[PDB]
Design a binder for this molecule. Structure first.
Ligand SMILES: NN1C(=O)C(=O)N=NC1=S
Ligand SMILES: NN1C(=O)C(=O)N=NC1=S
Ligand SMILES: NN1C(=O)C(=O)N=NC1=S
Lengths: 528, 182, 147, 122
């Protein structure tokens, strides 16, 4: 019994796996070691925690955990950490897969484990234990997308004495049908190591339900309050600054001189001075955006795949900055091709003006719809339409013989999609029937069918991504809020939440429980 | 040209593009066919009317082309002056435009929207069927002298047949997780 | 077959193992469709009909194994050379196909008629062995080829 | 002209025409407004780009009109020859056409379909 497929597993593990309770006691009373962690590669098969206690807990055998934790024979270490370091709570967070029954099971098992740990060790905060990756169970749930466990923890309410301090949702004055809940923000806004909001907003883009998690009551209200308190003013100021900068860029570029020698001497004139000032401002903004892109690439450390997956705004801004920098280089390199670069950072730049629509609910949802449509439907349609257009342009140009060039024929065929095809644009075909048949078939296939098909696909898509688009907009707002909070450039400390409140003031040690609670009112009209 | 269109046949292997191709097939089969029937009816009727009324554009082919150019949004609306009855020709062109361009094309759009709204899972199933056909064609004809078409190795299902012999079958292994009571 | 397809399982039970005159479960008519082929044909994918045909096929298979443990009844081919699973595939009997491809019987002396066999299932994770006998390549006509 | 538009105000008395007018109001309020915002963004950006690249069409107004003519399906696609960089101007016009005409207009259509599908009783 030395192979890795069933390595480490002992008689106690087999007894726990068989749902047998008397046999487990018979084994334990003999002297069985409950700390013989199973380090087999089969138990990273399925990975339950690599300990008999975690194995019992994750299989819904609460009785076995109850016996092991407080057995009179050999103590069971609730805080035991395996090779990966994931303790019992981390194992429960990992095993859960958001299923309703599994969600209820993990919620109940986590609650019972926490209660028992407090009972044995009232002075120990079990949930604060960190694995080898430095992620707390709440943080681990946030990273892995365990929405059910996240919702339970953020709404963990326990009324029993000696177990209240483990909760986060604490009731307040509730004389009548209106009650205010204090949601604990401990490590939900800033844990100083890694907060829930940071993990959710700065995820790796592969989390199954990164969008939905922010719908959790406390998190959604916290982010909305942050937006409505101070972030709104700063974001609108940034929007205005961007508009001013881009109008400056448009004025400077539009009034560029037509003369040669791209490096133009600064003639003594007020208008020329204004143009030079505008160019300097535009280049400074481009350098700032380039440095912003570099900073975001270095800090967030994208996985080399999230760049094109969930970070388009930063990518577009960085590419516009690259275009500006290449334009400046060509301007100082005696190359008149700088226009070809400059003009690309102008038009594209105005498109990025859609990035400042994240702050407005309707316009942000519109931008999210634009993103999704371009990603899926516009991409598929462009694939198929390019196939058809290249095929029929090649056919026509082979049949045609000034329009014998492939480029001209492709342009003429594309003009049919914008409803401008001549249908008789040439007379060199020499086979009128064949050319006419080709053009007619192309028109019916692409203009009549493919475009209307794109319309229908987009209608069906918007009919099925409404709430998804709203969730993505809220996620974008969360990302912007966190970026402003971490980087603000105004020397302000208004990122703090509702003042510290005396939750209970009677900790298990008798000390005072002070936590950065957040207050949410609500009204209940039934029986109260 | 037709050849490049068949390049859509190699989209069966990609789920999204295969489903798009299946939607294209279904739309062309049903909605594009019905629309072409009705639109050809209308276009032939109104082209015959105009060409009877017109008299270089007195040919049926030229009038049909000019009327079809309205569907691609290029109809002149005054492409001739030989009609000799401006009111009648104008009424004919207006009626054709409202019947076909405004109504029939938007109708094709609405029909296609309703169709895509009701053949999503059907399109996915047809894509999977096409993938199955391609898989079987490759398996039977491979042109590479390979024997990797076999499935998960023979497994001793029980080993105790009613005759007491060994039951060896080419079983295939599928894992799953049950979180209720187990 | 007439009794089996009309949901009169008691009549089949009596006829198959009557003490008076043996009833040939493998009997083939002019078309050659045996009892299982008849059950596959009669079914029309209806929920109640699907349950009826599933139960009747399971009982017929169990009784045939009981009488003739050494005989694979399902392997009998009609005049067209289509097995009951193959016949269901050809005729589009989705319910019967799903039942056969998931026919799981835990009872001893009747396990070898199944196709879905459980494997190591110590906890909440279990792996099923789906039999691919004549599902990928039967050498005569496989389910995938027919579909 | 505006006056004749107010002739829609006397459609309140007819159930079908009144509901049509209400749909017109809601669509103009929400979907037409959002689409105009985004389309003006795109059109101003690409008109500024083209007019910076172009040099009789060097005026901003003429370039904006020529680009807007693509939305009514009348864009020339070769309306000038002063760009001096055919590749860049062609890329700009193509990108604008795909972004606005193909996508944004069809997007407005889809948004309006979804909106009418949800404001019938309203
Ligand atoms: N394009 N072309 C010619 O140039 C010709 O001379 N004869 N046939 C054809 S199709
Ligand atoms: N087309 N046509 C003529 O050519 C004419 O001479 N008088 N009336 C008509 S409509
Ligand atoms: N517009 N323009 C000019 O007028 C010129 O002379 N050289 N390049 C460009 S882009």
């Amino acid at each position: 019994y030395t192979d890795s497929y069933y390595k480490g597993q002992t008689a106690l593990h087999i007894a726990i796996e068989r749902r047998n309770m008397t046999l487990v006691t018979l084994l334990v009373e003999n002297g069985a070691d409950v700390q013989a962690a199973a380090n087999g590669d089969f138990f990273k098969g399925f990975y339950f925690g690599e300990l008999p206690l975690s194995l019992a807990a994750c299989t819904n055998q609460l009785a076995i955990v109850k016996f092991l934790l407080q057995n009179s024979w050999q103590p069971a270490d609730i805080s035991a950490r395996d090779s990966v370091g994931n303790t019992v709570l981390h194992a429960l967070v990992e095993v859960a897969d958001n299923t309703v029954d599994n969600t209820k099971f993990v919620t109940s098992m986590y609650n019972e484990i926490l209660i028992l740990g407090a009972k044995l060790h009232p002075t120990l905060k079990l949930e604060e234990i960190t694995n080898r990756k430095g992620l707390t169970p709440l943080a681990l749930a946030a990273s892995s997308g365990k929405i059910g466990v996240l919702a339970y923890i953020l709404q963990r309410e326990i009324h029993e004495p000696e177990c209240r301090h483990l909760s986060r949702k604490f009731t307040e004055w509730a004389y009548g049908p209106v009650h205010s809940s204090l949601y604990d923000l401990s490590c939900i806004d800033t844990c100083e190591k890694n907060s829930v909001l940071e993990v959710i907003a700065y995820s790796s883009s592969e989390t199954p339900n990164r969008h939905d998690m922010l719908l959790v009551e406390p998190l959604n209200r916290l982010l909305q309050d942050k937006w409505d308190r101070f972030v709104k003013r700063i974001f609108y100021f940034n929007f205005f600054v961007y508009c001013l900068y881009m109008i400056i860029f448009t004025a400077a570029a539009y009034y560029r001189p037509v003369e040669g020698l791209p490096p133009y001497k600064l003639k003594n004139t007020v208008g020329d001075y204004f143009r030079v000032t505008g160019e300097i401002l535009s280049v400074s903004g481009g350098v700032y955006f380039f440095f912003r892109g570099i900073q975001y690439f270095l800090q967030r450390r994208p996985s080399l795949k999230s760049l094109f997956v969930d970070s388009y705004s930063e990518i577009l801004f960085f590419v516009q900055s690259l275009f500006m920098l290449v334009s400046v280089v060509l301007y100082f390199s005696q190359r008149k091709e700088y226009v070809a670069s400059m003009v690309f950072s102008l038009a594209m730049g105005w498109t990025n003006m859609l990035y400042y629509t994240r702050g407005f609910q309707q316009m942000g949802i519109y931008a999210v719809m634009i993103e999704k449509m371009i990603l899926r439907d516009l991409c598929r349609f462009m694939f198929v339409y390019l196939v058809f257009l290249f095929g029929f342009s090649t056919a026509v140009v082979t049949l045609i013989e000034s329009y014998n060039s492939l480029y001209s024929t492709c342009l003429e065929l594309f003009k049919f999609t914008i409803g401008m095809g001549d249908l008789e644009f040439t007379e060199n075909y020499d086979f009128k029937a064949v050319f006419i048949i080709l053009l007619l078939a192309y028109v019916i296939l692409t203009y009549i069918l493919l475009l209307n098909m794109l319309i229908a696909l987009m209608g069906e898509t918007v009919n099925k991504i409404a709430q998804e688009s709203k969730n993505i907009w809220k996620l974008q707002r969360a990302i912007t809020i966190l970026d402003t909070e971490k980087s603000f450039l105004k020397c302000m400390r208004k990122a703090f939440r509702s003042g510290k409140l005396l939750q209970v003031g009677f900790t298990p040690d008798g000390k005072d429980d002070y936590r950065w609670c957040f207050r949410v009112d609500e009204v209940n009209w039934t029986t109260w």
